[PDB]
Symmetry: C2
Subunit: 136 residues, 2 copies
Amino acid sequence: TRDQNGTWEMESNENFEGYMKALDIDFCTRKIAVRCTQTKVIDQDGDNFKDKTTSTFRHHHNYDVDFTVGVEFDEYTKSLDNRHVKALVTWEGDVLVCVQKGEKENRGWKKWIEGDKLYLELTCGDQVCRQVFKKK
Amino acid sequence: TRDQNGTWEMESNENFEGYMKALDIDFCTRKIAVRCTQTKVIDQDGDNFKDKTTSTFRHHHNYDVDFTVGVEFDEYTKSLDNRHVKALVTWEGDVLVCVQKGEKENRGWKKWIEGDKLYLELTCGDQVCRQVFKKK
């Protein structure tokens, strides 16, 4: 049949990456594109076609870590760089301090409550990242 | 206080990029990561901690094409390789065939209905991508 009308959702995709490589599309764009869902809405009247394609990309991470203050533990940083570190969490006053011994120097974090907000500082090398959290 | 229990929503995030760079996380991953919402659930029993961090990002784009079988039209392949092609669609039996005339050789696609599924094969050079769609 020549009637292609419908709302069409992709259920299988094969060699999308090879096709995109042949288009000289960069590795980054290919990595995102291949993870997209696709919906095609085809509105066809005879030989007249209106094709509306929607591409969706979703990213979702859960990262669970359990530890006891003062007991060195093994950490696998799966929601970041996916490296093995040996982490030691201690208290310095009211600040929770973690050193992550491993490949990177100066790697760790500090976490404390101030003014009913949670403060986190992550360090790696000469880089410090500062994050602030609100109670939901 | 040393009580860090709570469901915490991130409201400020500064020098995340420099930190991820120091961890050798690539630009492709960083552009996704800086746009994720972050929720940290801290369940703390004395010096025993369970930290659950959730991070989520959603994005979509659209790609619309209108054409008539047998009428050549200009197509700009936005969200693919961003080139101008001269597209000519014809029927070969019940198979809809497009040639995208332009810089890439052997560039085109074929689209047909079989059973109740839509089949698409996109070609560029010697690379063929095959996609299958079900009616939703």
